[PDB]
Amino acid sequence: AFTGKFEMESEKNYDEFMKLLGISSDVIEKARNFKIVTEVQQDGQDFTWSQHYSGGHTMTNKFTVGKESNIQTMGGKTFKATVQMEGGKLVVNFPNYHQTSEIVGDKLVEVSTIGGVTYERVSKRLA
């Protein structure tokens, strides 16, 4: 489905995965001590993903799968990357890191990747 409100309740290897990307220490501590809210609307091959900071800033990741698009990402800057799908899951690969999302009924989880490190998360489906 990939459609609904979600929010990051917890993380697994976020700290190190960040230390590889190279994020600022305060911003590192925020996401892990903060519920980044996450909405999604899989409107067909195009998606309207979003990553709200609880109403204030809103970063967004609109993209089209089997096509590619510019995506804002949690790295230093925007990149362009080929999002793809499989069946009950989602796929992407940027010239920077790799990531695959995977809905579970009423829960969004994601698993990022880059160099011997991988950051799982569990954006639950609630508010």
Swiss-Prot record:
Disulphide bond pairs: none
Distribution of this protein across tissues and organs: Isoform 1 is expressed in the jejunum, ileum, cecum and ascending colon intestine. Isoform 2 is xpressed in the gallbladder, duodenum, jejunum, ileum, cecum, ascending, transverse and descending colon, sigmoid colon and rectum. Isoform 2 is expressed in colorectal adenocarcinomas and their adjacent normal mucosa (at protein level).
GO cellular component, one term: cytosol
Keyword Cytoplasm: yes
Keywords, comma-separated and alphabetical: Acetylation, Cytoplasm, Lipid transport, Lipid-binding, Membrane, Transport
Gene3D superfamilies (alphabetical): 2.40.128.20
GO molecular function, one term: fatty acid binding
Sites of N-acetylalanine modification: A1
Domain of life: Eukaryota
CDD domains recorded: FABP6
Pfam short name (any one): Lipocalin_7
GO biological-process terms attached to the record: fatty acid transport; lipid metabolic process; negative regulation of cell population proliferation
Keyword Transferase tagged: no
Chain segments annotated as coiled-coil in the UniProt record: none
Induction: Isoform 1 is up-regulated by chenodeoxycholic acid (CDCA) via the FXR transcription pathway. Isoform 2 is up-regulated by NF-kappa-B and in all stages of colorectal adenocarcinoma. Isoform 1 is not up-regulated in all stages of colorectal adenocarcinoma.
Function of the molecule: Binds to bile acids and is involved in enterohepatic bile acid metabolism. Required for efficient apical to basolateral transport of conjugated bile acids in ileal enterocytes. In vitro binds to bile acids in the order: deoxycholic acid > cholic acid > chenodeoxycholic acid and respective BA conjugation modifies affinities in the order taurine-conjugated > glycine-conjugated > unconjugated bile acids. Stimulates gastric acid and pepsinogen secretion.
Similarity section: Belongs to the calycin superfamily. Fatty-acid binding protein (FABP) family.
Domain free text: Forms a beta-barrel structure that accommodates the hydrophobic ligand in its interior. Can bind at least two ligands per molecule, however, the stoichiometry is debated.
Name used for this protein in its record: Gastrotropin
Source species: Homo sapiens
